[PDB]
Design a protein around this nucleic acid. Structure first.
Lengths: 68, 195, 88, 84
RNA sequence: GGAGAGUUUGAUCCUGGCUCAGGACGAACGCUGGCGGCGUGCCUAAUACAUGCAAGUCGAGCGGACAGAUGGGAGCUUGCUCCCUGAUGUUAGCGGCGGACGGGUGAGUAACACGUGGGUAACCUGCCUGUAAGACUGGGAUAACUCCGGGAAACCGGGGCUAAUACCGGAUGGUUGUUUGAACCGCAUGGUUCAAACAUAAAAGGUGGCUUCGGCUACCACUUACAGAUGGACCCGCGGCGCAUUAGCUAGUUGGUGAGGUAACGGCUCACCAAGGCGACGAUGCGUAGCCGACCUGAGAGGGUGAUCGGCCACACUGGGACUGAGACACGGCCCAGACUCCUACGGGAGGCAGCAGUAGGGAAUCUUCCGCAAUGGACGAAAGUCUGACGGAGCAACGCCGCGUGAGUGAUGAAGGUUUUCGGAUCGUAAAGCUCUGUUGUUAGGGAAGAACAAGUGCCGUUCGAAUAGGGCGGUACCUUGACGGUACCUAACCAGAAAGCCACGGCUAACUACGUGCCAGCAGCCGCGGUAAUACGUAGGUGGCAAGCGUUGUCCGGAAUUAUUGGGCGUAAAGGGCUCGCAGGCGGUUUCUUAAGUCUGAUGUGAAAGCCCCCGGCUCAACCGGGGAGGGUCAUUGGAAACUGGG
RNA sequence: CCGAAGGUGGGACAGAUGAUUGGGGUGAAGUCGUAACAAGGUAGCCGUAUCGGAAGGUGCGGCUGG
């Protein structure tokens, strides 16, 4: 992070953009299933693209209102 | 706004008429004509709260602030909140008999202008104090919608007095909640906002 | 030094002025010594309210009003009472 | 027009050893903000003895005054009860 | 004014934590986005700043200037060019006043910094009032201006000249000091008033008008004293923090005498002595922090916060210093040292956005290099005026709150189409279309406020000055003026449902369900926990529900949580009785009575500013908001009653 | 004389980092035993000493929570 701390975050939605050395915005969200992981990567952030093929739960996972 | 749908879901005639529940008394939808289950305490309080707020068409910001201001008055709490939503000016237009719904009475206060004690009111949420002679200006003096609702004769409630031609609506002392609504259960809504 | 001066109160587009005994040093809306009543400009008529005796009390210890506060004193008529006191 | 009255205490002498002065324990005692029960606190003041007519264990009145030195703001009034 | 629910088990009751349902943000993020009002908008780097402004003003203090031409003449080409001192305007410099206010920031600061209450016989206070005495008589310089000389500049030095309301002598003075008498009064030092003498301590003129030219007067200014007012100082009671895995800390520290110093008391500073001072009621040390009115939550007690607004504080690139001035040890002043940026002719110079805009950086993250001094303040001026990034406004951002919207009445062919179906239909559902109709908003086009009162200039009238109807002050009228916002809010007419809805959830808590795909994969999740081919929990569609130009997630507060229990919990076995004693400090105290009045209760007085919460009315089209009026809040100070209880004798 | 900064010096506190190390937690059906729960096949536990790959054993005293 920008304070200097390495934490394991989580990438919630289905199929993610990220590589190594990717800019990531992190919110606080506990992932109970995987131990040691207590943040979420905000989807729709600086470089973490909005997820693919999603229409329900639009604002979470980042995707724009597609078209109709 | 469908507004038949609101009535058949809430299970109450929100106009108060033989319409909108005859031929289809179940709630809406694909899960409606089957035997629905009874609601919990939460569901009953929501039903009664939304019976009242879908009678008057209020958003919960105004509905909560009138709940609070009614708490700042004296007496019984849920009676005073009924009284404040029966001082609301769309309700005044539809209970003087100048519209067939409260949406038509909303459009009368919003643009098809109507007047209190003089100049004008463009605002449905105007709380109407007593003693206030409510009429229309000489521009919209008698036009087709107010003309129809004058031709149709409803009862004037005893907390109102209404004229046909001069069309001034004047008031009395206070609307007692015996007069206001038989179907809406108050003090389940006080309990709904008690939590 | 000590000056009876208007003090801004009210909303943005609708001003209001409390006629307020303050110092020239102190800020306009800030600290002040005592107040006399009010001044509504934005009424389409008149409506000034001056205490008219405690204002008179501050005038005599030495507190010279601003121009608009002075002519409000003249409108209620305290500068004539002050001139009658100096002619006394 | 009698002028304004200065603060006055009564107390108890801790020490005599400073030159022409004493210190005095005022035992006024007061209650809490929260639990309400009334607890005690001892406040020792520096007070001037211009005659040095004091002893340890002496009930004495003190007057407040202008600051007589560092930490001194008090003087004697009436030496009430002497130590035994 | 007080709601609970899931989860330890095969089942249960307790204990017990965890998790959820709420309200809030100076919030950010994601999806989405219509307006109007009012508020708010670098929380992070007290990081660094390009540029533009943010403090000047007075020609009624002064000298010199620049123009200018009322008349006066000048030389000729009809194109022009001066020289006398009219008004008239312009202001480098002296000088006075201001720059110490206003605006920013919260780094420091854990103690008089602040809040509250006092005390000053221990104090200062320009400008402002009000009253009383005055304002005499001279002197010598200097800026400007020139003439040199030195400097890259910054600028500096030398000789000349000149004025003041500049500065300095001098007279007269009820100050101040000394000395001697009194008189009365306290709270220890002491206080107030009277008299005398000695020693000094003032001051300035400018404008207008009257005129016998000596002067006389008003206004402003000057000096001294005494009050008021205002601002400032210092001192004390109480109060608001975490750690004891910080227990010992001080030596100008703790007192004295004397001196200096200060506006003043004081180890504030110094000499000389004494061995003191603070301390488990938490000294010292470390960490954190501007404090408060208030703000959020809560039934309240409390807990958290210290944005905006308002008071006090501290700071001004870092540390130190003084100067001047009434007041600074001075944000846009100075001198020095350090770092940084810049210029240099290498000798030396300049700078300080934590003023309003803006830039770069840090960051999840917060705005315009705008218009105006019209209004309210300020500074100066006799005033007109000038200055004013305070302030009025304007712009950007749904950042918040509030209000109006995206239609309305009628409508069964329950149209098409979606989804589902035991294929009878059910549903999206009167919701579309049909008919009728409004125009808030959208747009076009006209009309157009309050915010303005004034100042100043005239004319009156009363009045004080005056040698006087001059002339000026003071008061009342009676006119003529003044808008950045802005042809903005606002009103009126025309037109079309036309431009205007999304977000989240649907197992339970928790309102809201089906279908298709997946197959312990993809994934969801706050918890219980879903999903391994019949998934109401995953993804999609339909539907429903919640709200609504918002919605959801996050981060922190508070509640829920009686889960720090004072209100309001516990310790046989669930966590918890010291292994037990002797005891210091502390806490608690059987009975009768007298007395006291610290606690307690009660009264009066002051005060706890304004805004805020609350009550009551009023104005904005309602609302938010504004405004008026009141209430509330102290273990607060002084003062007066009670004596049951606690305490004292 | 005072005096900011700077200089020298010896200590005090605090954060990193350090070959190596010691205990701790969590993890794919790993290895060795089976110490405890029943009289858990030697009743268990508490304190203490000692020994032992390891749970543990043994002594002494105490406890029933036999």
């Amino acid at each position: 992070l920008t304070n200097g701390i390495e934490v394991t975050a989580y990438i919630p939605g289905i199929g993610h953009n990220l590589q190594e050395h990717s800019v990531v915005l992190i919110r606080g969200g506990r992932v109970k299933d995987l131990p040691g992981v207590r943040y979420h990567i905000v989807r729709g952030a600086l470089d973490t693209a909005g997820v693919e093929n999603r229409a329900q739960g639009r604002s979470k996972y980042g995707t724009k209102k597609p078209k109709a | 706004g469908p507004s038949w749908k609101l009535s058949r879901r809430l299970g109450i005639s929100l106009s108060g008429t033989g319409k909108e529940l005859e031929k289809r008394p179940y709630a809406p939808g694909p899960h409606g004509p089957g035997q629905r289950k009874k609601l919990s305490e939460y569901g009953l309080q929501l039903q009664e709260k939304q019976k009242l707020r879908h009678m008057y068409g209020v958003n919960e910001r105004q509905f909560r602030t009138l709940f609070d201001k009614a708490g700042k008055l004296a007496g019984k709490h849920g009676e005073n909140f009924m009284i404040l939503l029966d001082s609301r000016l769309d309700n005044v237009v539809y209970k003087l008999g100048l519209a067939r719904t409260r949406r038509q009475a909303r459009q009368l206060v919003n643009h098809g202008h109507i007047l209190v004690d003089g100049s004008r009111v463009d605002i449905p949420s105007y709380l109407v104090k007593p003693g206030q002679t409510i009429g229309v200006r000489e521009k919209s003096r008698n036009l087709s919608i107010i003309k129809e609702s004058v031709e149709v004769n409803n009862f004037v409630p005893e907390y109102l007095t209404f004229d046909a031609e001069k069309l001034e609506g004047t008031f009395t002392r206070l609307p007692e909640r015996s007069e206001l609504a038989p179907e809406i259960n108050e003090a389940l809504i006080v309990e709904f906002y008690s939590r | 030094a000590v000056k009876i001066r208007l003090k801004r109160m009210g909303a943005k587009k609708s001003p209001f002025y409390r006629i307020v005994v303050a110092d020239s040093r102190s800020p306009r809306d800030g600290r002040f010594i005592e107040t006399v009543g009010t001044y509504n400009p934005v009424a389409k008529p008149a409506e000034v309210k001056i205490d008219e005796e405690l204002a008179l009390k501050w005038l005599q210890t030495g507190a010279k009003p601003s121009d608009t506060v002075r002519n409000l004193f003249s409108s209620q008529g305290i500068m004539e009472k002050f001139h009658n006191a100096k002619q006394g | 027009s009698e002028r304004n009255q200065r603060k006055v205490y009564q107390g108890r002498v801790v020490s005599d050893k400073m030159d022409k002065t004493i210190t005095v324990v005022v035992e006024t005692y007061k209650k809490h903000t929260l639990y309400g029960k009334r607890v005690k606190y001892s406040k020792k003041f520096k007070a001037h003895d211009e005659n040095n007519q004091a002893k340890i264990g002496d009930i004495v009145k003190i007057m407040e005054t202008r600051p007589l030195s560092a930490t001194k703001r008090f003087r004697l009034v009436e030496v009430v009860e002497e130590a035994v």
